[PDB]
Tab-separated table of C-alpha atoms in Angstrom:
chain	number	residue	atom	x	y	z
A	303	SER	CA	193.951	-31.307	191.626
A	304	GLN	CA	194.957	-33.625	194.465
A	305	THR	CA	193.505	-31.158	196.978
A	306	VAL	CA	190.118	-31.272	195.246
A	307	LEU	CA	190.274	-35.048	195.406
A	308	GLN	CA	191.292	-34.947	199.077
A	309	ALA	CA	188.377	-32.731	200.094
A	310	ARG	CA	186.100	-35.070	198.154
A	311	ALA	CA	187.569	-38.039	200.026
A	312	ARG	CA	187.047	-36.233	203.339
A	313	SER	CA	183.355	-35.755	202.594
A	314	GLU	CA	183.064	-39.391	201.518
A	315	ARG	CA	184.707	-40.571	204.742
A	316	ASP	CA	182.276	-38.489	206.784
A	317	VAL	CA	179.244	-39.906	204.977
A	318	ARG	CA	180.706	-43.365	205.599
A	319	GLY	CA	180.829	-42.500	209.281
A	320	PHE	CA	177.197	-41.425	209.196
A	321	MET	CA	175.718	-44.189	207.035
A	322	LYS	CA	176.726	-47.382	208.857
A	323	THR	CA	174.694	-46.543	212.000
A	324	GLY	CA	172.206	-49.367	212.355
A	325	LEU	CA	171.903	-48.466	216.012
A	326	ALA	CA	170.407	-50.429	218.901
A	327	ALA	CA	167.974	-49.440	221.634
A	328	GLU	CA	170.190	-47.953	224.354
A	329	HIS	CA	172.448	-46.147	221.882
A	330	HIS	CA	169.668	-44.615	219.772
A	331	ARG	CA	168.348	-42.413	222.593
A	332	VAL	CA	171.689	-40.859	223.516
A	333	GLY	CA	172.489	-40.570	219.814
A	334	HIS	CA	169.458	-38.358	219.298
A	335	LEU	CA	170.316	-36.438	222.470
A	336	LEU	CA	173.881	-35.776	221.315
A	337	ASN	CA	172.733	-34.731	217.855
A	338	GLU	CA	170.327	-32.251	219.435
A	339	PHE	CA	173.073	-30.864	221.667
A	340	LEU	CA	175.493	-30.537	218.755
A	341	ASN	CA	172.889	-28.717	216.664
A	342	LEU	CA	172.490	-26.366	219.612
A	343	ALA	CA	176.270	-25.957	219.636
A	344	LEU	CA	176.696	-24.528	216.135
A	345	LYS	CA	174.746	-21.362	216.974
A	346	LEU	CA	177.149	-20.233	219.712
A	347	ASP	CA	179.905	-17.635	219.314
A	348	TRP	CA	182.962	-19.853	219.580
A	349	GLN	CA	185.503	-17.204	218.566
A	350	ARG	CA	184.656	-15.295	221.754
A	351	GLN	CA	186.822	-16.758	224.505
A	352	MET	CA	184.218	-15.913	227.151
A	353	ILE	CA	181.702	-18.184	225.420
B	40	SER	CA	192.541	-54.372	270.064
B	41	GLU	CA	190.860	-51.391	268.418
B	42	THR	CA	188.544	-52.042	265.481
B	43	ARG	CA	190.703	-51.503	262.386
B	44	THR	CA	189.053	-51.793	258.986
B	45	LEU	CA	190.285	-54.655	256.815
B	46	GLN	CA	193.659	-53.615	255.429
B	47	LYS	CA	192.590	-54.456	251.878
B	48	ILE	CA	189.421	-52.375	252.190
B	49	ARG	CA	191.369	-49.424	253.605
B	50	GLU	CA	193.897	-49.570	250.772
B	51	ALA	CA	191.193	-49.924	248.121
B	52	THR	CA	189.099	-47.031	249.427
B	53	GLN	CA	192.151	-44.797	249.839
B	54	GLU	CA	193.246	-45.459	246.263
B	55	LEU	CA	189.684	-44.993	244.995
B	56	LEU	CA	189.494	-41.614	246.712
B	57	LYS	CA	192.897	-40.772	245.235
B	58	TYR	CA	191.933	-41.484	241.630
B	59	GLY	CA	188.237	-40.582	241.831
B	60	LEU	CA	187.414	-43.760	239.896
B	61	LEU	CA	188.497	-47.391	239.888
B	62	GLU	CA	188.210	-49.754	236.932
B	63	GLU	CA	188.165	-53.535	236.842
B	64	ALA	CA	190.382	-53.653	233.749
B	65	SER	CA	193.285	-51.871	235.480
B	66	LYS	CA	192.987	-52.732	239.199
B	67	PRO	CA	190.656	-55.740	239.398
B	68	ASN	CA	191.638	-56.712	242.943
B	69	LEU	CA	190.572	-53.476	244.636
B	70	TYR	CA	187.527	-53.207	242.374
B	71	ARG	CA	186.334	-56.638	243.502
B	72	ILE	CA	187.189	-55.825	247.122
B	73	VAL	CA	184.930	-52.776	246.945
B	74	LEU	CA	182.177	-54.726	245.193
B	75	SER	CA	182.348	-57.258	248.032
B	76	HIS	CA	181.723	-54.611	250.708
B	77	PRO	CA	179.958	-51.706	248.954
B	78	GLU	CA	178.007	-50.769	252.078
B	79	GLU	CA	181.325	-50.537	253.933
B	80	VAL	CA	182.500	-48.027	251.331
B	81	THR	CA	179.237	-46.108	251.614
B	82	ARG	CA	179.622	-46.016	255.397
B	83	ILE	CA	183.185	-44.799	254.894
B	84	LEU	CA	182.421	-42.034	252.394
B	85	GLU	CA	179.081	-40.832	253.797
B	86	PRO	CA	180.542	-38.432	256.401
B	87	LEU	CA	182.544	-36.466	253.820
B	88	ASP	CA	179.347	-36.055	251.762
B	89	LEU	CA	180.826	-38.429	249.195
B	90	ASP	CA	179.098	-41.529	247.881
B	91	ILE	CA	179.790	-44.432	245.532
B	92	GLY	CA	178.141	-45.048	242.181
B	93	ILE	CA	178.570	-48.401	240.466
B	94	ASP	CA	178.467	-49.818	236.936
B	95	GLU	CA	179.216	-53.533	236.901
B	96	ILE	CA	178.364	-53.709	233.199
B	97	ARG	CA	181.403	-51.696	232.106
B	98	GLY	CA	183.462	-52.502	235.209
B	99	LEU	CA	183.715	-49.052	236.762
B	100	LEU	CA	183.383	-47.592	240.252
B	101	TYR	CA	183.253	-43.813	240.574
B	102	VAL	CA	182.898	-41.672	243.674
B	103	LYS	CA	180.148	-39.081	243.264
B	104	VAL	CA	179.061	-36.255	245.534
B	105	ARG	CA	176.378	-37.190	248.054
B	106	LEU	CA	173.071	-35.508	247.227
B	107	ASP	CA	171.294	-35.602	250.608
B	108	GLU	CA	171.881	-31.986	251.680
B	109	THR	CA	174.576	-30.631	249.352
B	110	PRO	CA	174.016	-27.076	248.031
B	111	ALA	CA	171.611	-27.277	245.097
B	112	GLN	CA	173.565	-24.521	243.318
B	113	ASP	CA	176.320	-27.009	242.467
B	114	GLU	CA	178.180	-29.975	243.939
B	115	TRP	CA	181.484	-28.614	242.607
B	116	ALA	CA	181.413	-26.144	245.510
B	117	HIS	CA	182.122	-29.139	247.739
B	118	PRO	CA	185.232	-28.416	249.846
B	119	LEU	CA	187.150	-31.588	248.962
B	120	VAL	CA	186.727	-31.585	245.169
B	121	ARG	CA	189.938	-30.214	243.680
B	122	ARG	CA	189.241	-30.006	239.947
B	123	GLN	CA	187.542	-26.974	238.444
B	124	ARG	CA	184.067	-27.053	236.956
B	125	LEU	CA	183.732	-28.196	233.373
B	126	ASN	CA	183.560	-25.484	230.712
B	127	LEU	CA	181.594	-25.664	227.498
B	128	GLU	CA	184.453	-26.167	225.037
B	129	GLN	CA	185.444	-29.121	227.200
B	130	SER	CA	181.775	-30.109	227.172
B	131	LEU	CA	181.743	-29.997	223.372
B	132	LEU	CA	184.781	-32.254	223.317
B	133	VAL	CA	183.016	-34.514	225.823
B	134	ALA	CA	179.983	-34.702	223.547
B	135	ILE	CA	182.094	-35.688	220.542
B	136	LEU	CA	183.950	-38.238	222.660
B	137	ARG	CA	180.658	-39.708	223.883
B	138	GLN	CA	179.384	-39.956	220.316
B	139	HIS	CA	182.495	-41.898	219.314
B	140	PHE	CA	182.203	-43.997	222.474
B	141	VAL	CA	178.655	-45.098	221.706
B	142	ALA	CA	179.573	-45.666	218.061
B	143	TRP	CA	182.290	-48.092	219.152
B	144	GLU	CA	180.205	-49.694	221.913
B	145	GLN	CA	177.601	-50.576	219.298
B	146	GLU	CA	180.097	-52.892	217.590
B	147	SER	CA	182.024	-54.041	220.668
B	148	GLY	CA	179.117	-54.308	223.092
B	149	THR	CA	179.817	-53.330	226.678
B	150	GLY	CA	183.257	-54.917	226.532
B	151	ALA	CA	186.532	-53.833	228.063
B	152	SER	CA	187.725	-50.332	227.210
B	153	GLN	CA	189.021	-50.701	223.653
B	154	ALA	CA	187.393	-47.344	222.830
B	155	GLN	CA	190.266	-45.775	220.908
B	156	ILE	CA	190.201	-42.895	218.432
B	157	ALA	CA	193.015	-41.318	216.454
B	158	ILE	CA	193.807	-37.717	217.337
B	159	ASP	CA	193.468	-36.837	213.654
B	160	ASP	CA	189.796	-37.876	213.733
B	161	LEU	CA	188.977	-35.157	216.274
B	162	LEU	CA	190.458	-32.217	214.355
B	163	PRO	CA	187.813	-32.221	211.577
B	164	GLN	CA	185.025	-32.388	214.160
B	165	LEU	CA	186.289	-29.549	216.348
B	166	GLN	CA	187.228	-27.464	213.309
B	167	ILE	CA	183.519	-26.940	212.612
B	168	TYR	CA	182.759	-25.245	215.938
B	169	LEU	CA	186.113	-23.754	216.956
B	170	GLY	CA	186.888	-22.399	213.486
B	171	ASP	CA	189.899	-22.853	211.214
B	172	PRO	CA	192.976	-20.847	212.279
B	173	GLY	CA	194.603	-22.146	209.108
B	174	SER	CA	197.487	-23.961	210.808
B	175	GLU	CA	197.202	-27.682	211.495
B	176	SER	CA	199.868	-27.383	214.189
B	177	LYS	CA	197.942	-24.617	215.963
B	178	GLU	CA	194.699	-26.595	216.029
B	179	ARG	CA	196.581	-29.702	217.158
B	180	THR	CA	197.984	-27.709	220.069
B	181	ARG	CA	194.472	-26.489	220.875
B	182	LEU	CA	193.048	-30.014	220.786
B	183	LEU	CA	195.872	-31.430	222.896
B	184	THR	CA	195.359	-28.734	225.521
B	185	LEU	CA	191.683	-29.677	225.626
B	186	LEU	CA	192.554	-33.360	225.978
B	187	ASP	CA	194.991	-32.595	228.793
B	188	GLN	CA	192.229	-30.707	230.584
B	189	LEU	CA	189.883	-33.666	230.096
B	190	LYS	CA	192.497	-36.143	231.327
B	191	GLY	CA	192.518	-33.958	234.414
B	192	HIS	CA	188.894	-35.042	234.851
B	193	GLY	CA	189.735	-38.648	233.973
B	194	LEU	CA	187.624	-38.896	230.822
B	195	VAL	CA	190.508	-39.769	228.461
B	196	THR	CA	194.029	-41.127	228.625
B	197	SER	CA	196.872	-38.953	227.406
B	198	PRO	CA	197.981	-39.565	223.803
B	199	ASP	CA	200.092	-42.675	223.274
B	200	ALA	CA	202.909	-43.212	220.770
B	201	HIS	CA	200.590	-43.503	217.744
B	202	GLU	CA	198.739	-40.264	218.582
B	203	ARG	CA	195.795	-42.287	219.909
B	204	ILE	CA	193.738	-42.003	223.090
B	205	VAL	CA	191.428	-44.318	225.013
B	206	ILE	CA	188.109	-42.974	226.269
B	207	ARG	CA	187.693	-43.948	229.904
B	208	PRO	CA	184.233	-45.545	230.303
B	209	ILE	CA	183.441	-42.958	232.997
B	210	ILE	CA	182.350	-40.653	230.176
B	211	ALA	CA	179.144	-42.673	229.831
B	212	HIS	CA	178.172	-41.515	233.339
B	213	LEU	CA	179.215	-37.880	232.902
B	214	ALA	CA	177.268	-37.819	229.626
B	215	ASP	CA	174.306	-40.054	230.470
B	216	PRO	CA	170.862	-39.033	229.189
B	217	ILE	CA	169.728	-37.102	232.279
B	218	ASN	CA	172.919	-35.029	232.369
B	219	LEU	CA	172.671	-34.475	228.619
B	220	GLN	CA	169.065	-33.301	228.878
B	221	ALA	CA	169.901	-30.926	231.720
B	222	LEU	CA	172.787	-29.473	229.716
B	223	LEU	CA	170.595	-29.254	226.620
B	224	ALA	CA	167.954	-27.206	228.432
B	225	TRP	CA	170.593	-24.938	229.950
B	226	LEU	CA	172.194	-24.416	226.535
B	227	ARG	CA	168.835	-23.636	224.925
B	228	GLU	CA	168.312	-21.062	227.667
B	229	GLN	CA	171.750	-19.591	226.969
B	230	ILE	CA	171.006	-19.311	223.252
B	231	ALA	CA	167.695	-17.636	224.079
B	232	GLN	CA	169.587	-15.081	226.163
B	233	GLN	CA	171.988	-14.578	223.246
B	234	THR	CA	169.052	-13.741	220.961
C	201	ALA	CA	222.529	-32.745	200.016
C	202	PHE	CA	223.459	-33.905	203.514
C	203	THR	CA	221.206	-36.944	203.150
C	204	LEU	CA	223.332	-37.917	200.158
C	205	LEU	CA	226.475	-37.077	202.131
C	206	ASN	CA	225.589	-39.660	204.765
C	207	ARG	CA	224.967	-42.399	202.214
C	208	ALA	CA	228.313	-41.457	200.661
C	209	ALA	CA	230.282	-42.286	203.811
C	210	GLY	CA	228.654	-45.697	204.165
C	211	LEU	CA	229.029	-46.669	200.495
C	212	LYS	CA	231.448	-49.544	200.959
C	213	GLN	CA	229.987	-51.657	198.158
C	214	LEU	CA	229.542	-49.499	195.039
C	215	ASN	CA	227.390	-52.217	193.491
C	216	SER	CA	226.257	-50.810	190.152
C	217	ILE	CA	225.396	-47.586	188.359
C	218	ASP	CA	221.668	-48.196	188.818
C	219	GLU	CA	221.925	-48.626	192.581
C	220	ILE	CA	223.793	-45.329	192.889
C	221	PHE	CA	220.810	-43.311	191.692
C	222	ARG	CA	218.158	-45.619	193.117
C	223	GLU	CA	219.539	-45.483	196.670
C	224	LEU	CA	221.884	-42.558	197.301
C	225	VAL	CA	221.301	-39.822	194.742
C	226	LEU	CA	217.598	-39.582	193.908
C	227	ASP	CA	215.601	-38.880	197.059
C	228	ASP	CA	212.425	-40.861	197.720
C	229	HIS	CA	209.065	-39.445	196.677
C	230	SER	CA	207.617	-42.944	196.336
C	231	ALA	CA	203.823	-42.988	196.380
C	232	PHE	CA	203.060	-46.097	198.441
C	233	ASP	CA	201.157	-44.202	201.140
C	234	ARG	CA	199.190	-42.200	198.569
C	235	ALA	CA	198.120	-45.449	196.914
C	236	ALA	CA	197.053	-46.748	200.316
C	237	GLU	CA	194.975	-43.593	200.751
C	238	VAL	CA	193.339	-44.074	197.344
C	239	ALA	CA	192.510	-47.666	198.267
C	240	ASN	CA	191.049	-46.566	201.607
C	241	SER	CA	188.865	-44.004	199.826
C	242	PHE	CA	187.625	-46.577	197.323
C	243	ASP	CA	186.773	-48.986	200.139
C	244	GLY	CA	185.068	-46.106	201.918
C	245	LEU	CA	182.771	-45.574	198.946
C	246	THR	CA	182.173	-49.296	198.482
C	247	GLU	CA	180.988	-49.274	202.092
C	248	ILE	CA	178.309	-46.711	201.228
C	249	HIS	CA	177.284	-48.789	198.234
C	250	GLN	CA	177.004	-51.939	200.349
D	40	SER	CA	169.660	-47.110	255.387
D	41	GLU	CA	171.894	-45.973	258.260
D	42	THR	CA	171.572	-42.647	260.048
D	43	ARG	CA	173.520	-39.528	259.109
D	44	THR	CA	176.547	-38.063	260.835
D	45	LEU	CA	175.964	-34.718	262.514
D	46	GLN	CA	176.290	-32.006	259.885
D	47	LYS	CA	178.691	-30.037	262.080
D	48	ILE	CA	181.057	-33.003	262.386
D	49	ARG	CA	180.981	-33.599	258.629
D	50	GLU	CA	181.611	-29.925	257.869
D	51	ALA	CA	184.492	-29.673	260.339
D	52	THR	CA	186.065	-32.889	259.047
D	53	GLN	CA	185.866	-31.691	255.447
D	54	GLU	CA	187.414	-28.366	256.464
D	55	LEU	CA	190.233	-30.122	258.322
D	56	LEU	CA	190.860	-32.266	255.255
D	57	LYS	CA	190.761	-29.355	252.797
D	58	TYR	CA	193.246	-27.257	254.776
D	59	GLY	CA	195.010	-30.026	256.705
D	60	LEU	CA	194.427	-28.129	259.952
D	61	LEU	CA	192.037	-26.157	262.133
D	62	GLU	CA	192.805	-23.149	264.330
D	63	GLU	CA	191.039	-22.069	267.507
D	64	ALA	CA	191.833	-18.413	266.783
D	65	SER	CA	190.343	-18.616	263.262
D	66	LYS	CA	187.449	-21.122	263.156
D	67	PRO	CA	186.429	-21.665	266.794
D	68	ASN	CA	183.139	-23.417	266.004
D	69	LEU	CA	184.716	-26.218	263.976
D	70	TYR	CA	187.686	-26.432	266.345
D	71	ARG	CA	185.639	-26.868	269.509
D	72	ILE	CA	183.092	-29.123	267.794
D	73	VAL	CA	185.863	-31.446	266.612
D	74	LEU	CA	187.502	-31.446	270.035
D	75	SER	CA	184.166	-32.214	271.729
D	76	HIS	CA	183.637	-35.125	269.315
D	77	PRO	CA	187.238	-36.369	269.155
D	78	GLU	CA	186.414	-40.064	269.202
D	79	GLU	CA	184.035	-39.552	266.280
D	80	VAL	CA	186.689	-37.664	264.306
D	81	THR	CA	189.331	-40.323	264.872
D	82	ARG	CA	186.785	-42.994	263.929
D	83	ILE	CA	185.960	-41.242	260.646
D	84	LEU	CA	189.628	-40.694	259.840
D	85	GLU	CA	190.814	-44.144	260.958
D	86	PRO	CA	189.944	-46.110	257.784
D	87	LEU	CA	191.852	-43.675	255.545
D	88	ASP	CA	194.984	-44.198	257.674
D	89	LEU	CA	194.495	-40.649	258.972
D	90	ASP	CA	194.446	-39.298	262.515
D	91	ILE	CA	194.328	-35.923	264.248
D	92	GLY	CA	197.174	-34.510	266.258
D	93	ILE	CA	195.981	-31.908	268.735
D	94	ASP	CA	197.563	-28.945	270.528
D	95	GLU	CA	195.654	-27.083	273.228
D	96	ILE	CA	198.581	-24.821	274.152
D	97	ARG	CA	198.909	-23.452	270.615
D	98	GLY	CA	195.244	-24.028	269.769
D	99	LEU	CA	196.052	-26.049	266.648
D	100	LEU	CA	194.506	-29.206	265.216
D	101	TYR	CA	196.083	-31.038	262.298
D	102	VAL	CA	196.035	-34.347	260.467
D	103	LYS	CA	198.811	-36.919	260.750
D	104	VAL	CA	199.410	-40.170	258.917
D	105	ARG	CA	198.342	-43.038	261.178
D	106	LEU	CA	200.428	-45.645	259.354
D	107	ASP	CA	202.339	-47.806	261.810
D	108	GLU	CA	206.015	-46.889	261.815
D	109	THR	CA	208.100	-48.615	259.116
D	110	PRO	CA	205.114	-50.819	258.168
D	111	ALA	CA	206.421	-52.136	254.840
D	112	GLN	CA	209.240	-49.747	253.903
D	113	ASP	CA	211.947	-47.835	255.732
D	114	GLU	CA	210.085	-44.579	255.010
D	115	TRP	CA	206.386	-44.812	254.248
D	116	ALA	CA	204.408	-43.697	251.206
D	117	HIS	CA	200.717	-42.851	251.560
D	118	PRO	CA	198.479	-42.836	248.460
D	119	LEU	CA	196.342	-39.830	249.388
D	120	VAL	CA	199.288	-37.638	250.467
D	121	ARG	CA	202.201	-36.513	248.286
D	122	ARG	CA	205.501	-36.018	250.118
D	123	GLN	CA	206.708	-32.825	248.480
D	124	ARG	CA	210.305	-31.659	248.871
D	125	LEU	CA	210.698	-27.886	248.980
D	126	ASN	CA	213.264	-26.195	246.778
D	127	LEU	CA	216.284	-24.546	248.365
D	128	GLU	CA	214.806	-21.071	248.889
D	129	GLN	CA	211.633	-22.464	250.418
D	130	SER	CA	213.689	-24.572	252.816
D	131	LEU	CA	215.578	-21.467	253.885
D	132	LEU	CA	212.364	-19.582	254.495
D	133	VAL	CA	210.869	-22.366	256.619
D	134	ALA	CA	214.127	-22.637	258.573
D	135	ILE	CA	214.212	-18.896	259.251
D	136	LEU	CA	210.572	-18.756	260.307
D	137	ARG	CA	210.999	-21.880	262.456
D	138	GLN	CA	213.915	-20.323	264.318
D	139	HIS	CA	212.090	-17.021	264.781
D	140	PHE	CA	208.967	-18.819	265.994
D	141	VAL	CA	211.072	-20.757	268.499
D	142	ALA	CA	212.586	-17.508	269.749
D	143	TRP	CA	209.085	-16.033	269.971
D	144	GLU	CA	207.995	-18.959	272.153
D	145	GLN	CA	211.079	-18.424	274.315
D	146	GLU	CA	210.277	-14.749	274.904
D	147	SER	CA	206.491	-15.194	275.176
D	148	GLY	CA	206.011	-18.832	276.162
D	149	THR	CA	204.595	-21.585	273.964
D	150	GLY	CA	201.285	-20.807	272.269
D	151	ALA	CA	200.647	-17.689	274.362
D	152	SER	CA	200.763	-15.159	271.507
D	153	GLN	CA	200.874	-15.384	267.724
D	154	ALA	CA	204.270	-14.966	266.076
D	155	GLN	CA	204.760	-11.876	263.906
D	156	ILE	CA	207.609	-10.458	261.831
D	157	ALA	CA	208.236	-7.635	259.378
D	158	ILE	CA	209.156	-8.145	255.725
D	159	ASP	CA	212.019	-5.674	256.142
D	160	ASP	CA	213.490	-7.990	258.791
D	161	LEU	CA	213.335	-11.045	256.505
D	162	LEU	CA	214.607	-9.520	253.257
D	163	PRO	CA	218.120	-8.789	254.626
D	164	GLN	CA	218.590	-12.434	255.603
D	165	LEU	CA	217.306	-13.693	252.253
D	166	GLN	CA	219.870	-11.409	250.616
D	167	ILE	CA	222.497	-12.696	253.057
D	168	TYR	CA	221.843	-16.347	252.320
D	169	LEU	CA	220.879	-16.328	248.611
D	170	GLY	CA	222.363	-13.225	246.971
D	171	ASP	CA	221.040	-10.033	245.434
D	172	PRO	CA	218.579	-10.612	242.547
D	173	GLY	CA	219.180	-7.094	241.210
D	174	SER	CA	216.966	-4.735	243.203
D	175	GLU	CA	214.798	-4.387	246.283
D	176	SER	CA	211.776	-4.841	244.013
D	177	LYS	CA	213.000	-8.244	242.820
D	178	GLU	CA	213.755	-9.282	246.404
D	179	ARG	CA	210.226	-8.326	247.429
D	180	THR	CA	208.731	-10.149	244.437
D	181	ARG	CA	210.667	-13.318	245.277
D	182	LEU	CA	209.656	-13.070	248.930
D	183	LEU	CA	206.010	-12.546	247.966
D	184	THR	CA	206.062	-15.585	245.682
D	185	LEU	CA	207.601	-17.716	248.430
D	186	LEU	CA	205.162	-16.394	251.031
D	187	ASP	CA	202.243	-17.250	248.752
D	188	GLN	CA	203.680	-20.740	248.297
D	189	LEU	CA	203.893	-21.244	252.064
D	190	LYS	CA	200.392	-19.799	252.489
D	191	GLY	CA	199.344	-22.639	250.207
D	192	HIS	CA	200.740	-25.100	252.759
D	193	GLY	CA	199.139	-23.209	255.643
D	194	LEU	CA	202.472	-21.980	257.008
D	195	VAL	CA	202.061	-18.186	256.719
D	196	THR	CA	199.332	-15.569	256.596
D	197	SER	CA	198.968	-12.804	254.037
D	198	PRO	CA	200.913	-9.538	254.404
D	199	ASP	CA	199.016	-7.005	256.506
D	200	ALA	CA	198.900	-3.214	256.783
D	201	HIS	CA	202.271	-3.167	258.593
D	202	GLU	CA	203.985	-5.282	255.903
D	203	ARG	CA	204.073	-7.872	258.706
D	204	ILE	CA	203.018	-11.519	258.594
D	205	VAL	CA	201.973	-14.130	261.149
D	206	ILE	CA	203.679	-17.519	261.347
D	207	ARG	CA	201.134	-20.321	261.451
D	208	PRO	CA	201.629	-22.486	264.576
D	209	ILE	CA	201.620	-25.589	262.342
D	210	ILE	CA	205.402	-25.199	262.104
D	211	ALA	CA	205.735	-26.537	265.659
D	212	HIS	CA	204.729	-29.970	264.299
D	213	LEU	CA	207.008	-29.987	261.247
D	214	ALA	CA	208.553	-33.307	260.253
D	215	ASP	CA	212.351	-32.950	260.521
D	216	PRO	CA	213.458	-29.688	262.175
D	217	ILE	CA	216.926	-31.150	262.773
D	218	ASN	CA	217.385	-31.408	259.011
D	219	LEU	CA	216.447	-27.723	258.850
D	220	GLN	CA	219.148	-26.950	261.416
D	221	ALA	CA	221.649	-28.976	259.386
D	222	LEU	CA	220.730	-27.042	256.239
D	223	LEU	CA	221.093	-23.742	258.103
D	224	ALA	CA	224.553	-24.760	259.330
D	225	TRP	CA	225.525	-25.777	255.796
D	226	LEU	CA	224.346	-22.359	254.629
D	227	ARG	CA	226.239	-20.332	257.215
D	228	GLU	CA	229.299	-22.356	256.203
D	229	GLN	CA	228.733	-21.673	252.489
D	230	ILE	CA	228.150	-17.939	252.962
D	231	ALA	CA	231.636	-17.869	254.497
D	232	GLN	CA	233.479	-20.247	252.158
D	233	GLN	CA	231.978	-18.749	248.981
D	234	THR	CA	233.567	-15.376	249.807
């Protein structure tokens, strides 16, 4: 059962990472830019070395 | 007799060319020397089609390719540059590093480079894109190879004793909004070709 | 086995029967670090709640 | 701000820096342009502690550290240049090619004609001075690896249709040929003592 609890803790840690962001002006823009780029990233074929 | 450039300026510019960048927090003397005669450094680097960018806020001087008449195809074709062009797995790692960098800068302001992240924190992030080969050692080797490649470009220090790295502030200028929005358009185009 | 062997050579004292098992014989699966992890998860959730 | 350096001068300087040399027989435009603007080239290179040595007889240009002799240490160290030390086999190959080039300049005069040699004439001496690796194929592989390494330093050309190679005239300006002679004497003593 400890593995179930550990995956749960991993998800909780990630939401902690996401929640706290009360960003400022300069950061907010590049934050949106990076999120857009990362969302672009997921749709690539990473397992292909050429990509 | 002959006009010899100030010894300090010569040493500072030679070292700056050597390392590609020069930070206040690690070599303040040469950094200040350059900041005291920036037009001297521009006059020195102009003939090689190299220039000097500046960020006094973070305390960083980085040589960047002159734009005047360099081939628009890419500045990496420049004869003197030695390091290979960045590749998109490295660019993914750069994006994650920049996200962590801004996250830390929010709390610490634009202070000295205390931007440190445990190696373990990267593995979950990369695991999403680069898959799960089901062997923590294998993915650690993969990540460490990527970080070695990036240290080749000066974006991150090599891992220390506690499996931690420090993100060199130069990343903010390799991943600034204009560069990010050029890369984003190019990547959207690539995905469109994939479809 | 060899971990016990080492602690056998250095056993100059032979304090008491309890110490034998507590130090040399029974290896250490103590859960201090796991408790630290549980605490760091609970603080992580309290952060969300705050 | 200030005016721009002539594009030809900048290009030739960047070439000379990338390859550490220029050759009249290979890149005549850059060579003659640099020679016709020599003061400009030495002015550009001066503040990096760099200077150009020139050779009209052999038609070779090359860079040379301009640091004043024994400036701060008995033997200098320059940030932008790394003073590599060749491994044993490489030292033997440079010694052999140096001696053969010298003989070529005796029979032909200095810089009158390019030096050439056949692989079949080098392999026997490599076997003489280092030992048999196991086959002619392994000897040729080792020689090819070494020749590529020297080509990296600009000391040898690629093998041609005759299995021959050309010795780059840069060897005439090597640092310590007397040390090469000493190593060769040590070797001809060892080849005797060892057996």
